[PDB]
Amino acid sequence: GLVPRGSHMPFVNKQFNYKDPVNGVDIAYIKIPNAGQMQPVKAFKIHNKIWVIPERDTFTNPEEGDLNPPPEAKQVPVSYYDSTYLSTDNEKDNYLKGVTKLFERIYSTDLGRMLLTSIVRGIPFWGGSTIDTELKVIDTNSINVIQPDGSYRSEELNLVIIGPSADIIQFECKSFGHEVLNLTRNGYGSTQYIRFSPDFTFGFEESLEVDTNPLLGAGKFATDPAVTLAHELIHAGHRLYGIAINPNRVFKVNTNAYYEMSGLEVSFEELRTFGGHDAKFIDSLQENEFRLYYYNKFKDIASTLNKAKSIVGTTASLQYMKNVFKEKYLLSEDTSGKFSVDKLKFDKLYKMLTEIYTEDNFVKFFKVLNRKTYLNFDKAVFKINIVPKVNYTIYDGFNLRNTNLAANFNGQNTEINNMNFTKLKNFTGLFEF
Ligand SMILES: [Li+]
Ligand SMILES: [Li+]
Ligand SMILES: [Li+]
Ligand SMILES: [Zn+2]
Protein backbone atom coordinates (compact mmCIF):
# COMPACT_ATOMS: atom_id res chain seq x y z
CA GLY A 1 0.00 0.00 0.00
CA LEU A 2 0.93 3.66 0.31
CA VAL A 3 3.97 5.01 2.16
CA PRO A 4 2.36 5.89 5.48
CA ARG A 5 2.93 8.77 7.91
CA GLY A 6 1.71 7.00 11.05
CA SER A 7 -1.49 7.22 13.10
CA HIS A 8 -3.43 10.46 12.61
CA MET A 9 -7.09 11.59 12.99
CA PRO A 10 -9.36 11.01 9.94
CA PHE A 11 -9.75 13.85 7.43
CA VAL A 12 -13.49 13.26 7.43
CA ASN A 13 -14.75 12.67 10.94
CA LYS A 14 -18.29 11.74 9.97
CA GLN A 15 -19.26 8.73 7.90
CA PHE A 16 -22.02 10.49 6.02
CA ASN A 17 -25.10 8.73 4.73
CA TYR A 18 -26.83 10.50 1.90
CA LYS A 19 -30.22 10.05 3.57
CA ASP A 20 -29.06 11.50 6.96
CA PRO A 21 -31.54 14.31 7.81
CA VAL A 22 -30.45 17.83 7.12
CA ASN A 23 -29.26 19.71 10.23
CA GLY A 24 -28.37 22.99 8.59
CA VAL A 25 -24.75 22.84 9.76
CA ASP A 26 -22.78 20.11 7.93
CA ILE A 27 -25.72 18.44 6.14
CA ALA A 28 -27.76 21.16 4.54
CA TYR A 29 -29.60 22.45 1.49
CA ILE A 30 -27.36 24.99 -0.11
CA LYS A 31 -27.42 27.54 -2.90
CA ILE A 32 -24.43 28.97 -4.80
CA PRO A 33 -24.21 32.75 -4.94
CA ASN A 34 -25.85 34.77 -7.72
CA ALA A 35 -28.13 31.91 -8.66
CA GLY A 36 -31.47 33.62 -8.55
CA GLN A 37 -34.16 31.05 -8.01
CA MET A 38 -32.01 27.93 -8.17
CA GLN A 39 -33.56 25.19 -6.08
CA PRO A 40 -31.31 24.33 -3.12
CA VAL A 41 -29.25 21.12 -3.27
CA LYS A 42 -28.41 18.77 -0.38
CA ALA A 43 -24.67 19.07 0.46
CA PHE A 44 -22.28 17.58 2.99
CA LYS A 45 -19.51 19.40 4.76
CA ILE A 46 -16.62 16.83 5.03
CA HIS A 47 -14.05 19.05 6.64
CA ASN A 48 -13.54 22.70 7.51
CA LYS A 49 -13.79 24.65 4.19
CA ILE A 50 -14.55 21.59 2.05
CA TRP A 51 -18.02 20.45 0.96
CA VAL A 52 -19.38 17.69 -1.28
CA ILE A 53 -22.49 17.91 -3.44
CA PRO A 54 -23.32 14.46 -4.70
CA GLU A 55 -25.36 15.69 -7.67
CA ARG A 56 -24.50 15.94 -11.36
CA ASP A 57 -23.40 19.50 -12.04
CA THR A 58 -26.35 21.15 -13.75
CA PHE A 59 -26.02 24.24 -11.61
CA THR A 60 -22.56 25.94 -11.96
CA ASN A 61 -22.42 26.65 -15.72
CA PRO A 62 -25.54 28.08 -17.41
CA GLU A 63 -24.24 26.50 -20.66
CA GLU A 64 -24.42 23.00 -19.11
CA GLY A 65 -27.95 21.97 -17.93
CA ASP A 66 -28.73 18.99 -20.16
CA LEU A 67 -27.15 15.69 -19.18
CA ASN A 68 -28.30 14.09 -22.41
CA PRO A 69 -25.59 12.74 -24.65
CA PRO A 70 -25.41 14.68 -27.86
CA PRO A 71 -26.05 12.89 -31.26
CA GLU A 72 -23.50 10.01 -31.76
CA ALA A 73 -22.14 11.97 -34.76
CA LYS A 74 -21.42 14.95 -32.42
CA GLN A 75 -19.49 13.32 -29.52
CA VAL A 76 -15.67 13.41 -29.24
CA PRO A 77 -13.71 10.05 -28.78
CA VAL A 78 -12.60 10.57 -25.18
CA SER A 79 -15.94 11.25 -23.49
CA TYR A 80 -18.62 9.23 -21.92
CA TYR A 81 -22.32 10.00 -21.43
CA ASP A 82 -24.92 8.53 -19.07
CA SER A 83 -27.74 10.90 -18.20
CA THR A 84 -28.92 8.65 -15.32
CA TYR A 85 -25.70 8.35 -13.44
CA LEU A 86 -25.90 9.86 -9.87
CA SER A 87 -29.68 10.21 -10.14
CA THR A 88 -30.71 7.98 -7.25
CA ASP A 89 -30.22 8.10 -3.52
CA ASN A 90 -28.12 4.93 -3.42
CA GLU A 91 -25.76 6.26 -6.05
CA LYS A 92 -25.44 9.49 -4.11
CA ASP A 93 -24.69 7.59 -0.95
CA ASN A 94 -22.00 5.64 -2.81
CA TYR A 95 -20.61 8.83 -4.26
CA LEU A 96 -20.26 10.32 -0.79
CA LYS A 97 -18.60 7.24 0.53
CA GLY A 98 -16.24 6.96 -2.50
CA VAL A 99 -15.18 10.63 -2.30
CA THR A 100 -14.70 10.29 1.45
CA LYS A 101 -12.50 7.29 1.04
CA LEU A 102 -10.33 9.01 -1.57
CA PHE A 103 -9.74 12.01 0.65
CA GLU A 104 -8.78 9.64 3.46
CA ARG A 105 -6.35 7.76 1.09
CA ILE A 106 -4.77 11.12 0.12
CA TYR A 107 -4.58 12.38 3.68
CA SER A 108 -2.92 9.12 4.79
CA THR A 109 0.19 10.19 2.91
CA ASP A 110 2.48 12.98 4.08
CA LEU A 111 2.26 14.57 0.63
CA GLY A 112 -1.59 14.47 0.91
CA ARG A 113 -1.58 15.87 4.38
CA MET A 114 0.61 18.71 3.15
CA LEU A 115 -1.61 19.41 0.10
CA LEU A 116 -4.95 19.20 2.02
CA THR A 117 -3.44 21.45 4.72
CA SER A 118 -2.46 24.02 2.06
CA ILE A 119 -5.94 23.77 0.61
CA VAL A 120 -7.71 24.43 3.96
CA ARG A 121 -5.31 27.32 4.66
CA GLY A 122 -5.73 28.73 1.17
CA ILE A 123 -8.72 30.97 2.10
CA PRO A 124 -9.71 33.08 -0.98
CA PHE A 125 -8.44 36.61 -0.32
CA TRP A 126 -10.82 39.29 1.03
CA GLY A 127 -10.45 41.58 -1.98
CA GLY A 128 -14.12 42.58 -1.99
CA SER A 129 -14.02 46.12 -0.59
CA THR A 130 -14.57 49.08 -2.84
CA ILE A 131 -12.48 51.17 -0.36
CA ASP A 132 -9.01 50.29 1.02
CA THR A 133 -9.37 51.23 4.74
CA GLU A 134 -11.71 48.24 4.97
CA LEU A 135 -11.21 44.54 4.31
CA LYS A 136 -14.28 42.76 2.82
CA VAL A 137 -14.98 39.20 1.68
CA ILE A 138 -15.81 38.47 -2.00
CA ASP A 139 -19.18 36.82 -1.62
CA THR A 140 -18.67 34.47 -4.54
CA ASN A 141 -16.26 32.60 -2.25
CA SER A 142 -19.20 31.60 -0.07
CA ILE A 143 -22.34 29.41 -0.20
CA ASN A 144 -25.77 30.07 1.21
CA VAL A 145 -26.77 27.46 3.68
CA ILE A 146 -30.38 26.94 4.74
CA GLN A 147 -30.55 26.87 8.55
CA PRO A 148 -33.05 24.93 10.65
CA ASP A 149 -35.27 27.96 10.86
CA GLY A 150 -35.41 28.17 7.00
CA SER A 151 -33.27 31.31 6.83
CA TYR A 152 -29.96 31.48 4.80
CA ARG A 153 -26.57 32.05 6.32
CA SER A 154 -23.55 32.68 4.16
CA GLU A 155 -20.56 30.45 4.75
CA GLU A 156 -17.05 30.85 3.35
CA LEU A 157 -15.48 27.79 1.85
CA ASN A 158 -12.54 26.85 -0.25
CA LEU A 159 -13.45 23.64 -2.15
CA VAL A 160 -16.62 21.86 -3.34
CA ILE A 161 -16.48 18.42 -4.96
CA ILE A 162 -19.54 17.94 -7.19
CA GLY A 163 -20.65 15.37 -9.67
CA PRO A 164 -19.82 15.66 -13.38
CA SER A 165 -21.84 17.48 -15.92
CA ALA A 166 -23.00 15.84 -19.17
CA ASP A 167 -19.64 14.32 -20.06
CA ILE A 168 -19.02 12.08 -17.16
CA ILE A 169 -15.26 11.93 -17.47
CA GLN A 170 -14.53 15.61 -17.92
CA PHE A 171 -13.42 16.84 -14.47
CA GLU A 172 -13.52 20.59 -14.92
CA CYS A 173 -13.03 23.21 -12.22
CA LYS A 174 -15.58 26.02 -12.10
CA SER A 175 -15.24 29.08 -9.90
CA PHE A 176 -16.90 32.49 -9.57
CA GLY A 177 -16.18 36.14 -9.17
CA HIS A 178 -13.84 36.23 -12.20
CA GLU A 179 -15.85 38.31 -14.62
CA VAL A 180 -13.31 41.13 -14.18
CA LEU A 181 -10.48 39.76 -12.00
CA ASN A 182 -8.80 36.49 -12.85
CA LEU A 183 -8.97 35.38 -9.23
CA THR A 184 -7.14 32.10 -9.94
CA ARG A 185 -4.15 34.00 -11.44
CA ASN A 186 -3.82 37.23 -9.50
CA GLY A 187 -2.81 35.86 -6.09
CA TYR A 188 -6.32 36.16 -4.57
CA GLY A 189 -7.70 32.68 -5.18
CA SER A 190 -11.35 31.75 -5.30
CA THR A 191 -13.57 28.82 -4.08
CA GLN A 192 -13.14 25.92 -6.51
CA TYR A 193 -15.94 23.62 -7.66
CA ILE A 194 -14.34 20.37 -8.93
CA ARG A 195 -16.48 18.01 -11.07
CA PHE A 196 -15.32 14.54 -10.12
CA SER A 197 -16.60 10.94 -9.91
CA PRO A 198 -15.08 8.19 -7.88
CA ASP A 199 -17.26 5.72 -9.85
CA PHE A 200 -15.25 5.61 -13.10
CA THR A 201 -11.53 5.42 -13.88
CA PHE A 202 -9.26 5.42 -16.98
CA GLY A 203 -7.22 2.71 -18.55
CA PHE A 204 -3.60 3.16 -19.47
CA GLU A 205 -0.69 1.12 -20.86
CA GLU A 206 2.35 0.04 -18.89
CA SER A 207 4.75 0.42 -21.79
CA LEU A 208 5.76 3.96 -22.57
CA GLU A 209 5.82 3.38 -26.31
CA VAL A 210 2.35 1.98 -26.28
CA ASP A 211 0.78 4.47 -23.82
CA THR A 212 2.07 7.50 -25.82
CA ASN A 213 0.82 5.97 -29.13
CA PRO A 214 -2.80 6.73 -30.12
CA LEU A 215 -3.22 3.43 -32.07
CA LEU A 216 -2.07 0.83 -29.54
CA GLY A 217 -3.25 -0.76 -26.28
CA ALA A 218 -6.68 -1.35 -24.80
CA GLY A 219 -6.05 0.00 -21.26
CA LYS A 220 -4.72 -2.92 -19.36
CA PHE A 221 -4.10 -1.00 -16.16
CA ALA A 222 -6.57 1.20 -14.41
CA THR A 223 -5.60 4.53 -12.97
CA ASP A 224 -6.13 4.75 -9.17
CA PRO A 225 -8.84 7.34 -8.71
CA ALA A 226 -6.98 8.73 -5.65
CA VAL A 227 -4.30 9.93 -8.09
CA THR A 228 -6.98 11.49 -10.29
CA LEU A 229 -8.59 13.28 -7.32
CA ALA A 230 -5.10 14.39 -6.20
CA HIS A 231 -4.43 15.79 -9.64
CA GLU A 232 -7.63 17.91 -9.45
CA LEU A 233 -6.71 18.94 -5.83
CA ILE A 234 -3.28 20.16 -7.07
CA HIS A 235 -5.00 22.34 -9.68
CA ALA A 236 -7.32 23.59 -6.96
CA GLY A 237 -4.26 24.38 -4.75
CA HIS A 238 -2.76 26.56 -7.48
CA ARG A 239 -6.15 28.25 -7.99
CA LEU A 240 -6.75 28.93 -4.28
CA TYR A 241 -3.37 30.61 -4.04
CA GLY A 242 -4.14 32.59 -7.27
CA ILE A 243 -1.08 31.20 -9.13
CA ALA A 244 -2.62 29.01 -11.82
CA ILE A 245 -1.05 29.57 -15.26
CA ASN A 246 -3.32 31.00 -18.02
CA PRO A 247 -4.34 28.03 -20.18
CA ASN A 248 -3.32 30.06 -23.19
CA ARG A 249 0.31 29.37 -22.13
CA VAL A 250 0.96 26.09 -23.90
CA PHE A 251 3.57 23.64 -25.06
CA LYS A 252 3.08 23.02 -28.76
CA VAL A 253 4.02 19.44 -28.34
CA ASN A 254 6.93 18.34 -30.49
CA THR A 255 8.25 15.49 -28.44
CA ASN A 256 5.60 13.04 -29.60
CA ALA A 257 5.15 12.56 -33.34
CA TYR A 258 1.38 11.95 -32.96
CA TYR A 259 0.79 15.09 -30.94
CA GLU A 260 2.84 17.08 -33.49
CA MET A 261 1.13 15.78 -36.58
CA SER A 262 -2.21 16.79 -35.10
CA GLY A 263 -0.82 20.12 -33.75
CA LEU A 264 -1.92 19.17 -30.21
CA GLU A 265 -1.05 21.64 -27.51
CA VAL A 266 -0.91 21.10 -23.72
CA SER A 267 -1.17 23.92 -21.21
CA PHE A 268 1.72 24.73 -18.93
CA GLU A 269 -0.72 24.43 -16.07
CA GLU A 270 -1.15 20.71 -16.94
CA LEU A 271 2.61 20.00 -17.33
CA ARG A 272 3.20 21.74 -14.00
CA THR A 273 0.50 19.66 -12.31
CA PHE A 274 1.77 16.39 -13.72
CA GLY A 275 5.35 17.14 -12.67
CA GLY A 276 8.17 14.65 -13.35
CA HIS A 277 9.88 15.07 -16.70
CA ASP A 278 6.84 16.87 -18.12
CA ALA A 279 7.38 20.05 -16.11
CA LYS A 280 10.71 20.47 -17.89
CA PHE A 281 8.83 21.31 -21.06
CA ILE A 282 7.78 24.54 -19.55
CA ASP A 283 9.97 27.19 -21.04
CA SER A 284 12.26 28.36 -18.31
CA LEU A 285 12.12 31.95 -19.49
CA GLN A 286 8.36 31.86 -19.28
CA GLU A 287 8.51 30.08 -15.96
CA ASN A 288 10.82 32.71 -14.54
CA GLU A 289 8.40 35.40 -15.79
CA PHE A 290 5.49 33.59 -14.09
CA ARG A 291 7.32 33.49 -10.74
CA LEU A 292 8.04 37.18 -10.86
CA TYR A 293 4.47 37.95 -11.85
CA TYR A 294 3.04 35.95 -8.95
CA TYR A 295 5.54 37.44 -6.58
CA ASN A 296 4.28 40.94 -7.56
CA LYS A 297 0.67 39.89 -7.04
CA PHE A 298 1.57 38.74 -3.55
CA LYS A 299 3.18 42.13 -2.93
CA ASP A 300 -0.12 43.76 -4.01
CA ILE A 301 -1.92 41.64 -1.43
CA ALA A 302 0.50 42.64 1.30
CA SER A 303 -0.14 46.35 0.37
CA THR A 304 -3.87 45.83 0.44
CA LEU A 305 -3.67 44.26 3.89
CA ASN A 306 -1.45 47.12 5.07
CA LYS A 307 -4.10 49.71 4.16
CA ALA A 308 -6.98 47.90 5.89
CA LYS A 309 -7.82 49.42 9.26
CA SER A 310 -11.27 47.92 9.83
CA ILE A 311 -13.06 44.71 8.77
CA VAL A 312 -16.61 44.37 7.35
CA GLY A 313 -19.00 41.83 8.85
CA THR A 314 -19.01 39.97 12.16
CA THR A 315 -17.61 36.45 11.38
CA ALA A 316 -14.08 37.44 12.40
CA SER A 317 -12.02 40.34 13.59
CA LEU A 318 -9.65 42.41 11.42
CA GLN A 319 -6.73 40.94 13.31
CA TYR A 320 -7.97 37.34 12.81
CA MET A 321 -8.23 37.90 9.06
CA LYS A 322 -4.91 39.80 8.61
CA ASN A 323 -3.31 36.84 10.38
CA VAL A 324 -5.19 34.22 8.25
CA PHE A 325 -3.58 35.91 5.15
CA LYS A 326 -0.22 36.38 6.77
CA GLU A 327 -0.32 32.65 7.30
CA LYS A 328 -1.65 31.84 3.84
CA TYR A 329 0.94 33.83 1.91
CA LEU A 330 3.72 33.52 4.51
CA LEU A 331 4.10 37.26 4.78
CA SER A 332 6.76 38.92 6.94
CA GLU A 333 5.73 41.50 9.46
CA ASP A 334 7.97 44.43 10.46
CA THR A 335 8.54 46.17 13.86
CA SER A 336 5.85 48.63 12.74
CA GLY A 337 3.22 45.97 11.80
CA LYS A 338 3.57 46.32 8.06
CA PHE A 339 3.45 43.08 6.04
CA SER A 340 5.91 42.34 3.17
CA VAL A 341 6.66 39.39 0.89
CA ASP A 342 10.04 37.70 1.65
CA LYS A 343 11.65 36.41 -1.61
CA LEU A 344 12.96 33.27 0.10
CA LYS A 345 9.58 32.39 1.60
CA PHE A 346 7.75 33.17 -1.59
CA ASP A 347 10.09 30.81 -3.47
CA LYS A 348 9.40 28.11 -0.85
CA LEU A 349 5.58 28.48 -1.03
CA TYR A 350 5.52 28.63 -4.83
CA LYS A 351 7.73 25.60 -5.08
CA MET A 352 5.66 23.65 -2.58
CA LEU A 353 2.44 24.35 -4.51
CA THR A 354 3.90 23.83 -7.98
CA GLU A 355 6.79 21.28 -7.69
CA ILE A 356 6.17 19.31 -4.56
CA TYR A 357 2.39 18.80 -5.06
CA THR A 358 2.42 16.97 -8.43
CA GLU A 359 0.75 13.88 -9.84
CA ASP A 360 4.04 12.12 -10.31
CA ASN A 361 4.95 12.66 -6.70
CA PHE A 362 1.60 11.30 -5.57
CA VAL A 363 2.25 8.14 -7.55
CA LYS A 364 5.42 7.64 -5.53
CA PHE A 365 3.49 7.95 -2.26
CA PHE A 366 0.68 5.67 -3.27
CA LYS A 367 3.00 3.06 -4.84
CA VAL A 368 0.63 2.62 -7.70
CA LEU A 369 1.23 2.14 -11.34
CA ASN A 370 0.23 5.26 -13.39
CA ARG A 371 0.81 7.02 -16.64
CA LYS A 372 4.44 8.17 -16.83
CA THR A 373 3.62 11.37 -18.67
CA TYR A 374 0.65 13.58 -19.30
CA LEU A 375 1.65 13.44 -23.04
CA ASN A 376 -0.04 10.16 -23.75
CA PHE A 377 -3.34 8.99 -25.13
CA ASP A 378 -6.26 7.69 -23.06
CA LYS A 379 -7.15 4.04 -23.82
CA ALA A 380 -10.43 3.27 -22.09
CA VAL A 381 -12.92 4.21 -19.34
CA PHE A 382 -14.08 1.67 -16.71
CA LYS A 383 -16.96 1.55 -14.23
CA ILE A 384 -15.65 0.73 -10.72
CA ASN A 385 -16.88 0.66 -7.13
CA ILE A 386 -14.32 1.52 -4.53
CA VAL A 387 -16.71 1.60 -1.60
CA PRO A 388 -16.56 -2.01 -0.45
CA LYS A 389 -13.28 -2.72 1.44
CA VAL A 390 -13.05 -6.02 -0.46
CA ASN A 391 -12.59 -3.88 -3.62
CA TYR A 392 -10.46 -0.96 -2.48
CA THR A 393 -8.92 0.34 0.71
CA ILE A 394 -7.64 3.57 2.07
CA TYR A 395 -4.12 2.07 2.49
CA ASP A 396 -3.77 -0.10 -0.59
CA GLY A 397 -6.25 1.16 -3.16
CA PHE A 398 -6.90 -1.75 -5.50
CA ASN A 399 -3.66 -3.56 -4.67
CA LEU A 400 -5.03 -5.21 -1.58
CA ARG A 401 -2.57 -6.73 0.91
CA ASN A 402 -3.06 -10.40 1.74
CA THR A 403 -4.60 -11.05 -1.61
CA ASN A 404 -3.36 -12.05 -5.03
CA LEU A 405 -3.74 -8.31 -5.85
CA ALA A 406 -1.01 -7.06 -3.52
CA ALA A 407 1.95 -7.63 -5.81
CA ASN A 408 2.91 -6.28 -9.26
CA PHE A 409 0.01 -3.88 -9.24
CA ASN A 410 -2.27 -6.88 -9.86
CA GLY A 411 -5.17 -4.97 -8.32
CA GLN A 412 -4.89 -2.29 -11.07
CA ASN A 413 -4.41 -4.93 -13.73
CA THR A 414 -7.88 -5.04 -15.26
CA GLU A 415 -7.28 -8.53 -16.70
CA ILE A 416 -6.33 -10.19 -13.39
CA ASN A 417 -8.71 -8.08 -11.30
CA ASN A 418 -11.43 -8.17 -13.87
CA MET A 419 -14.34 -8.29 -11.33
CA ASN A 420 -13.47 -4.73 -10.30
CA PHE A 421 -13.67 -3.15 -13.75
CA THR A 422 -16.41 -2.94 -16.37
CA LYS A 423 -15.06 -1.45 -19.55
CA LEU A 424 -17.54 1.07 -20.92
CA LYS A 425 -15.71 2.47 -23.92
CA ASN A 426 -12.65 2.06 -25.96
CA PHE A 427 -10.83 5.12 -27.02
CA THR A 428 -7.97 3.65 -28.97
CA GLY A 429 -8.62 3.78 -32.75
CA LEU A 430 -11.14 6.62 -32.40
CA PHE A 431 -8.25 8.99 -32.41
CA GLU A 432 -7.93 11.20 -35.44
CA PHE A 433 -5.14 9.21 -37.19
LI1 LIG B 1 -27.33 5.01 -13.65
LI1 LIG C 1 -5.75 -3.08 2.44
LI1 LIG D 1 -15.60 -6.83 -15.38
ZN1 LIG E 1 -5.22 18.58 -15.13
Curated annotation (Swiss-Prot):
The record marks R371, Y374 as: Transition state stabilizer. Coiled coil: none annotated. The active site is at E232. Zn(2+) binds at H231, H235, E270. Changing Y374A: Light chain has 40% cleavage activity on SNAP25, 30% decrease in Zn(2+). Has slow autocatalytic activity, cleaves 250-Tyr-Tyr-251, 266-Phe-Gly-267, 419-Phe-Thr-420, 423-Phe-Glu-424, 430-Cys-Val-431, 432-Arg-Gly-433, 438-Lys-Thr-439, and probably 429-Leu-Cys-430 over a period of 4 weeks. Catalysis of the '197-Gln-|-Arg-198' bond in SNAP25 is estimated to be 10(5) more efficient than autocatalysis, leaving the physiological importance of autocatalysis in doubt. Ubiquitinated by host HECD2. Deubiquitination by host VCPIP1 prevents degradation by the proteasome. It comes from the Bacteria. Changing E270A: Light chain has 20% cleavage activity on SNAP25, 40% decrease in Zn(2+). It is found in: Secreted; Host cytoplasm, Host cytosol. Changing F274A: Light chain has 50% cleavage activity on SNAP25, no effect on Zn(2+) binding. Has proteolytic activity. After translocation into the eukaryotic host cytosol LC hydrolyzes the '197-Gln-|-Arg-198' bond in SNAP25, blocking neurotransmitter release. Recognizes the '146-Met--Gly-155' region of SNAP25, which confers substrate specificity. Hydrolyzes the '202-Thr-|-Arg-203' bond of mouse SNAP23, but not in human which has a different sequence. Reduction of the interchain disulfide bond occurs in the host cytosol and probably prevents retrotranslocation into the synaptic vesicle. Has protease activity. This is Botulinum neurotoxin A light chain. It comes from Clostridium botulinum. The lineage of its organism: Bacteria, Bacillati, Bacillota, Clostridia, Eubacteriales. The chain holds residues 1 to 425 of 1296 of the full protein.
